[PDB]
Design a protein around this ligand. Structure first.
Ligand code: CHL
Ligand code: CHL
Ligand code: CHL
Ligand code: CHL
Ligand code: CHL
Ligand code: CHL
Ligand code: CHL
Ligand code: CHL
Ligand SMILES: CC1=C[C@H](O)CC(C)(C)[C@H]1/C=C/C(C)=C/C=C/C(C)=C/C=C/C=C(C)/C=C/C=C(C)/C=C/C1=C(C)C[C@H](O)CC1(C)C
Ligand SMILES: CC1=C(/C=C/C(C)=C/C=C/C(C)=C/C=C/C=C(C)/C=C/C=C(C)/C=C/C2=C(C)CCCC2(C)C)C(C)(C)CCC1
Lengths: 216, 82, 231, 66, 220, 225, 41
């Protein structure tokens, strides 16, 4: 069959290769229920797209900061810097605005999950065709896909779906690495990369100080 | 130490116990003792090159008992005074 | 092929003499698929010819300028004295990289389109009368074979090319490792071995990395490393 | 006669199916409750392996893993 | 041709296995009863072969740096290339200035050896399954042969040896591996007793056999 | 001999690894490789392994720990040395001279053991009795000698029952031979009871384990270890 | 996964989750608002 995460091991029997990024990886069998599988597919897609946006918004400002062009604060300090530099914008007001806007869009996504195509009735400002949804976790339409990269050809859509899911998984692992590297070095990720590129034989996890708590 | 009393006692005890086991004076893997202390043959199924049925387990236990008896005798003679 | 790389071994079922220099040597089985085999044959051909030109250049430069280390030939003051234009005519290496980047992007994209589809970029794009025959992949011909030396035994001269190219690749690896271990050119290394064979060989130089850790080339610092952790 | 290792390969499938069925081990309790006595009987008979089955081998395996 | 065997041990050990002396006094190679688990006969012969090959690498490798340093081939001192002083046991000593620190080397080793060992394990559990999925084209030579101990092929048997003497070569491999296992055990025991290299122990026994042996080493 | 929170952390982590191994073994020996009934009924082999291998080797290993770790660290502790200045246990393992500074017989090594000059080890294998006046506990050298003697006794005791090499006792024969004039058929049929009824075994073992716990309470108050 | 979620829906597991939530809510209320004796603010 297809390529699997553990060569020589059969894929999970509830994973038949229809979903993008299906490598048969479910050792805990969390996706046995098809409805729970659709829910977890939406979870993986939302997590991966959020991670991709977050990793880009961490990396490109940090790359620009490393070159000396700008002085954008590191990702672990940007909330503090924003609060100290914006006394007229309280934290609670910003949190309330974020919560109501995200609640609107996520409740629309949730109600589409419960009943697909139900947001297509024109109740939101007359939007009908763009809120119908192409597949589970893939809305599409003229609003979410304005360049029409999903409406061209089927094979192009499957290729882009594979690209999206694999880059999303890579970005999720990258954000986990960001957390672990900040907790171990106290520096940004591009700072860590520059330190590794400067002298890679001595700049390792074994020399940060916390991954190996002993002296050695 | 080669001609010492301890080495002589240990070697004599081990050799005597092994020789007693080989010539049927002790219970063996191939012969077992009755509750009335009578030796009768037993099919242990252990292959050995010795024509008298002396096996490797017999060597192990008889050397162990020879070492034990020799060590106890050595410590007793040191306690009493050799 | 018929004569194999070792006595007693067997050739793989996909290697039985289509290509020149076929000794039935694929212990890792990388050429088991024909598309991968075609790609790796193109890679072997270009690697062989580039190492061929490289060994010729390294050997010839030590004849003409024995005082210039070929490992240090990229240094701006080791360049020949020629006018690159501007207020002083000095090198800049940015435009020097740009020339090679543009020209090689063009010619290697042409070769790549040839590799993807056979006889697809044989025609000259500007003067459409000009054409390349391309009898086999990796063997364009035409203006690339002006003297027509492939009109005779093509297989024999292909075998000569691939065997000399393999020798050149091994020799270039030897050149690089010798230059990193001794800090001298290949013919200087040969002369040192001919002077003191038992006192100057691999056993006296393999522990040292004579190349400096970093070098400064007109404002930027290029990090350097040997191919093995010498000191 | 001969002391040796003897096991059975994969006797019981590892599954959560019986986790969802309280009283599965007992012939009387597997049918489900009618009264609240079934709630107490399920906990009282949970480790009485010899009451679940008369096979000494299954009892011994249960005792070993417990 | 026969060590301390028994009627139980000779019932399945007939001589078909390589290096078969019938030496199974704990009857651990009994096929009946031992269906599942690691005391199956197939896994035990496999583990003997794996231990044999690793021990042959270790027995050649725990004494070669000391021998080459004693002979002056390598420039390191013979004391600092002793196998337990090279950084495997940092209480016993660490080698100064490898190109990488030993813990980063252990990280790389964990990744690479896990790749190798898990592919080997999947060949044992599912024979021929490592020749299916794409592995940069290397899956052509990783199909195995149906015998987990003896994969062979274009890489593992790249010189095509054993055309007619494969059983004799298997016997030679197992004999040399058992000797190497005993040698590595001796390396460990002599390291614990004498606190010197195995070659130092050999040269001490060769120079003065009476004053340098297991009896005199326990004396002090 | 534990002197730092790090050593308690290591035991906590190692205990959880062994706890996960025990839960794995329970799943494994029920769902994957469950032993048959004749495996469980090898009471002669079980008694041999649990006397020589569990109790005997356990007592020997703990005597080794006491001698090599507990004795020098507690000797330095009772001498008044600060716990941070006391060397770590592996320093006593690796440096024999540091061991011989406290117990001079360690300079002779293992030679007194193998030449049966056991009286040379009298500095750390003692028979003092009573309590340590500094700490109010039993002498740790006494406990090391106790555990060594117990280990040898249990290793001897674990070679009584016949398993696979002819020698040894059959428990059924011992039970059936012990009958007298007042007691009818005697202990006949008890082997079949104790190899087929888990409840009879549980009754015997619970009685002896509970009596042992009460004896432990009395001996731990009277001779505080 | 269906059988596992059915086991989590059994009465003692549901009771454990619900009482953990209720006890935690009471604990965190008494932590954030220590010593509440009367309804006065
Ligand atoms: C997951 C997505 C994501 C999140 C949560 C953040 C979070 C943040 N960013 Mg990042 N970014 C994100 C994606 C990306 N960012 C960037 C590039 C940058 C830069 C260059 C900077 C930030 C900064 C900030 C901070 C202040 C944001 C602000 O002032 O909004 C302003 C929002 C508006 C003015 C409203 C938007 C208009 C709307 C239509 C009405 C905040 C911590 C700043 C910083 O680091 O700290 C102050 C900063 O300088 N982001 C790129 C490219 C992304 C993709
Ligand atoms: C008391 C003397 C005595 C002792 C201690 C032994 C002890 C032993 N002999 Mg033995 N024998 C003895 C007297 C004699 N043997 C033999 C002839 C043999 C033979 C031919 C063999 C033994 C072997 C053995 C060993 C058999 C068990 C084993 O496998 O060990 C480990 C064992 C070490 C054999 C063997 O198993 O290993 C060498 C063997 O092949 N014996 C003769 C002449 C018939 C004896 C006369 O006194
Ligand atoms: C050479 C002969 C010989 C002599 C003179 C001794 C002498 C002695 N042994 Mg020993 N033994 C001897 C051979 C042997 N011993 C032993 C095994 C033992 C053991 C296991 C022990 C002795 C003990 C003793 C002492 C008993 C004192 C007493 O009355 O306790 C009376 C005790 C009670 C009434 C209770 C005594 C000094 C004891 C000793 O170790 O302490 C000094 C002791 O525990 N002997 C074995 C079998 C291996 C022997 C053969
Ligand atoms: C491709 C053939 C080629 C080979 C084999 C060499 C070999 C060498 N050059 Mg040379 N050069 C080559 C082409 C060129 N060089 C130079 C100009 C220089 C200079 C100025 C210097 C060298 C130096 C060196 C030496 C040290 C290299 C090193 O360790 O750096 C470490 C290597 C790296 C950090 C990576 C280098 C290439 C790497 C394999 C990746 C290839 C680059 C890709 C384009 C990456 C793609 C980037 C993407 C993401 C945009 C070594 C003998 C140095 C020297 O030692 O002289 C004393 C030196 O200072 N070369 C130019 C400009 C005209 C070249 C044109 O192609
Ligand atoms: C299994 C083989 C083997 C291994 C793992 C090593 C390991 C090492 N040697 Mg050694 N050597 C080995 C065989 C041999 N060496 C040497 C001669 C030397 C020298 C002269 C030196 C080393 C040095 C080193 C270290 C630096 C790497 C290097 O110089 O590569 C050498 C690569 C080869 C020899 C390829 C074969 C490294 C720890 C250096 C060291 O001692 O301190 C940094 C050093 O100066 N080796 C000879 C004789 C030619 C060998 C046969
Ligand atoms: C009460 C403890 C206990 C008993 C009686 C058994 C009994 C059995 N086990 Mg189970 N096991 C036990 C605990 C555990 N087991 C397992 C995991 C397994 C597996 C994976 C397998 C068994 C197998 C077997 C069977 C074959 C006997 C054997 O393989 O020994 C052979 C023993 C060895 C060859 C040596 C073991 C190496 C070990 C490192 C020795 C060290 C033990 C020391 C006590 C360690 C402490 C001292 C050290 C520090 C010096 C037999 C039914 C096998 C079976 O099921 O199929 C036939 C089998 O494959 N057991 C774990 C998880 C680690 C346990 C804890
Ligand atoms: C399910 C009951 C429950 C509820 C409603 C809360 C509620 C809260 N907890 Mg609490 N906790 C609860 C159970 C438990 N918590 C914790 C451990 C913590 C920690 C360590 C923290 C909270 C914090 C918080 C607050 C923000 C999240 C919020 C008031 C945070 C807080 O106190 O304010 C931000 C915080 O730091 N909880 C444990 C482990 C003992 C629980 C069991
Ligand atoms: C029926 C008997 C009874 C009554 C009426 C009370 C009443 C009270 N107790 Mg007492 N308790 C009672 C039995 C017991 N108490 C205690 C142990 C304690 C302690 C240790 C404490 C109390 C406290 C309290 C107060 C909690 C107020 C609160 O948390 O508001 C919260 C209101 C809600 C959660 C309403 C729900 C709102 C929704 C979440 C939205 C309240 C006066 C606390 C107080 O500080 O003392 C005055 C306190 O610290 N009780 C025990 C032993 C376990 C009892 C049995
Ligand atoms: C068969 C029989 C049968 C019956 O029935 C039962 C019984 C009796 C039990 C049996 C017996 C047996 C035997 C004796 C076992 C033992 C063994 C051996 C020793 C193992 C090893 C084994 C061993 C092996 C693994 C090994 C390996 C080694 C290694 C590689 C090493 C490495 C090293 C190197 C080089 C160098 C550096 O510097 C360091 C290191 C890194 C450290
Ligand atoms: C005659 C003959 C021969 C020979 C043989 C021999 C010479 C043998 C030997 C053998 C031997 C000579 C053996 C021995 C053994 C011993 C042992 C096996 C021991 C053991 C010991 C022990 C076990 C100990 C223990 C202990 C300890 C540790 C401490 C405490 C106490 C005691 C003592 C208990 C041959 C075959 C050639 C040929 C034919 C004939």
């Amino acid at each position: 069959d297809r390529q699997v995460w553990f060569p020589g091991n059969a894929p999970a029997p509830h994973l038949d290769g229809s979903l993008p990024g299906d490598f048969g990886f479910d050792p805990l069998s969390l996706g046995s229920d098809p409805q729970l599988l659709k829910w977890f597919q939406q979870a993986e897609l939302v997590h991966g797209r959020t991670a991709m946006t977050a990793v880009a918004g961490i990396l490109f400002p940090a790359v620009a900061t490393k070159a000396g062009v700008v002085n954008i604060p590191q990702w672990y300090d940007a909330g503090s810097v924003w609060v100290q530099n914006n006394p007229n914008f309280p934290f609670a007001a910003l949190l309330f605005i974020q919560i109501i806007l995200t609640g609107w869009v996520e409740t629309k996504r949730w109600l589409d999950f419960k009943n697909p195509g139900s947001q297509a009735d024109g109740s939101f400002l007359g939007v009908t065709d763009d809120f119908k949804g192409v597949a589970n976790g893939y809305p599409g339409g003229k609003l979410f896909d304005p360049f029409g990269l999903s409406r061209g050809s089927e094979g192009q859509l499957q290729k882009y779906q594979e690209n999206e899911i694999k880059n999303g998984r890579l970005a999720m692992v990258a954000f986990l690495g960001f957390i672990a590297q900040h907790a171990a070095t106290g520096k940004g990720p591009i700072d860590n990369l520059a330190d590794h590129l400067a002298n890679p034989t001595a700049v390792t996890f074994a020399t940060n100080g916390v991954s190996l708590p002993f002296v050695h | 130490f080669i001609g010492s009393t301890t080495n002589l006692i240990i070697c004599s005890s081990t050799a005597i116990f092994l020789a007693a086991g080989r010539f049927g004076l002790t219970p063996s893997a191939n012969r077992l003792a009755s509750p009335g202390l009578k030796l009768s043959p037993n099919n242990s199924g252990l292959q050995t090159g010795d024509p008298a049925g002396f096996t490797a387990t017999d060597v192990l236990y008889l050397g162990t008992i020879g070492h034990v008896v020799g060590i106890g005798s050595i410590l007793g003679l040191k306690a009493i005074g050799a | 092929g018929r004569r194999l790389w070792a006595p007693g071994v067997e050739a793989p079922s996909y290697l039985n003499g289509e290509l020149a220099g076929d000794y039935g040597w694929d212990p890792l089985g990388l050429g088991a698929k024909p598309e991968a085999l075609k790609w790796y044959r193109q890679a072997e051909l270009v690697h062989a010819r580039w190492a061929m030109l490289a060994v010729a250049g390294i050997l010839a430069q030590e004849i003409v300028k024995p005082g210039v280390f070929f490992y240090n030939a990229g240094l701006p003051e080791n360049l020949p004295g020629i006018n690159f234009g501007g207020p002083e005519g000095k090198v800049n290496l940015g435009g020097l990289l740009a020339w090679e980047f543009l020209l090689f992007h063009w010619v290697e994209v042409r070769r790549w389109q040839d590799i993807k589809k056979k006889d697809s970029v044989n025609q000259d794009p500007i003067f459409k009368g000009n054409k390349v025959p391309n009898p086999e992949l990796g063997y364009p011909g035409g203006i690339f074979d002006p003297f027509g030396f492939s009109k005779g035994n093509f297989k024999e001269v292909q075998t000569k090319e691939i065997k000399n190219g393999r020798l050149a690749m091994v020799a270039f690896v030897g050149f690089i490792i010798q230059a990193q271990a001794t800090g001298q050119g290949p013919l200087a290394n040969l002369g040192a071995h001919l002077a003191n064979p038992f006192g100057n060989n691999i056993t006296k130089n393999i522990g040292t990395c004579a190349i400096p850790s970093s070098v400064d080339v007109q404002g930027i610092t290029i990090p350097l490393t040997c191919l093995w952790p010498g000191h | 006669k001969k002391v040796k290792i003897v096991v059975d390969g994969n006797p019981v499938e590892t599954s959560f199916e019986r986790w969802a069925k309280p009283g599965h081990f007992s012939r009387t309790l597997s049918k489900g409750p009618s009264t609240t006595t079934w709630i107490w009987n399920l906990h009282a008979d949970a480790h009485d392996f010899d009451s679940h089955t008369s096979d000494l081998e299954e009892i011994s395996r249960k005792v070993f893993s417990a | 041709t026969l060590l301390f065997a028994s009627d139980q041990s000779l019932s399945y050990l007939t001589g078909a296995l390589p290096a078969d002396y019938g030496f199974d006094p704990l009857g651990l190679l009994d096929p009946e009863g031992k269906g599942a688990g690691f005391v199956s006969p197939a896994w035990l012969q496999y583990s003997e072969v794996i231990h044999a090959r690793w021990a042959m690498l270790g027995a050649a490798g725990c004494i070669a740096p000391e021998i080459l340093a004693t002979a002056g081939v390598i420039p390191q001192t013979p004391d600092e290339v002793i196998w337990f002083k090279s950084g495997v046991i940092p209480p016993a000593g660490v080698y100064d200035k490898y190109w990488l620190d030993p813990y980063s080397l252990f990280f790389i080793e964990v990744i690479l050896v896990q790749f190798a060992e898990l592919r080997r394990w999947q060949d044992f559990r599912n024979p021929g399954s490592q020749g299916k999925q794409y592995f940069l084209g290397l899956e052509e030579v990783l199909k195995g042969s149906g015998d987990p101990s003896y994969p062979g092929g274009q890489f593992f048997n790249l010189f095509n040896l054993g055309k007619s003497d494969l059983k004799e070569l298997k016997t030679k491999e197992l004999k040399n591996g058992r000797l190497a296992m005993l040698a590595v055990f001796g390396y460990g025991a002599q390291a614990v007793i004498t606190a010197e290299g195995p070659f130092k122990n050999l040269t001490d026994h060769l120079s003065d056999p009476t004053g340098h042996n297991i009896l005199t080493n326990f004396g002090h | 001999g534990i002197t730092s929170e790090l050593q308690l952390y290591s035991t906590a982590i190692g205990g959880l690894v062994l706890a996960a191994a025990m839960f794995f073994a329970g799943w494994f020996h029920y769902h994957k490789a469950a032993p048959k009934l004749e495996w469980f009924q090898n009471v002669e082999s079980m008694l041999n392994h649990h006397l020589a291998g569990l109790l005997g080797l356990g007592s020997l290993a703990w005597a080794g720990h006491q001698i090599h770790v507990s004795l020098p660290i507690n000797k330095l502790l009772d001498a008044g040395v600060d716990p941070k200045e006391i060397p770590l246990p592996h320093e006593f393992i690796l440096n024999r001279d540091l061991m011989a500074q406290l117990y001079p017989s360690f300079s002779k090594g293992l030679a007194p053991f193998f030449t049966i000059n056991w009286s040379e080890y009298s500095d750390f294998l003692t028979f003092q009795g009573g309590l340590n006046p500094v700490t109010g506990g039993l002498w740790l050298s006494d406990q090391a000698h106790h555990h060594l003697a117990i280990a040898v006794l249990f290793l001897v005791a674990g070679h009584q029952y016949r398993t696979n090499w002819g020698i040894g006792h059959s428990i059924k024969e011992i039970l059936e031979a012990h009958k007298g004039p007042f007691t009818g058929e005697g202990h006949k049929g008890l082997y079949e009871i104790l190899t087929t009824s888990w409840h009879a075994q549980l009754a015997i073992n619970l009685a002896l384990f509970g009596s042992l716990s009460i004896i432990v309470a009395h001996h731990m108050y009277s001779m505080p270890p | 996964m269906k059988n596992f979620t059915t086991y989590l829906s059994t009465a003692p597991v549901v009771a454990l989750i619900w009482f953990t939530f209720t006890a935690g809510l009471l604990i965190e209320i008494n932590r954030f608002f220590p010593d509440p004796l009367v309804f006065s603010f």
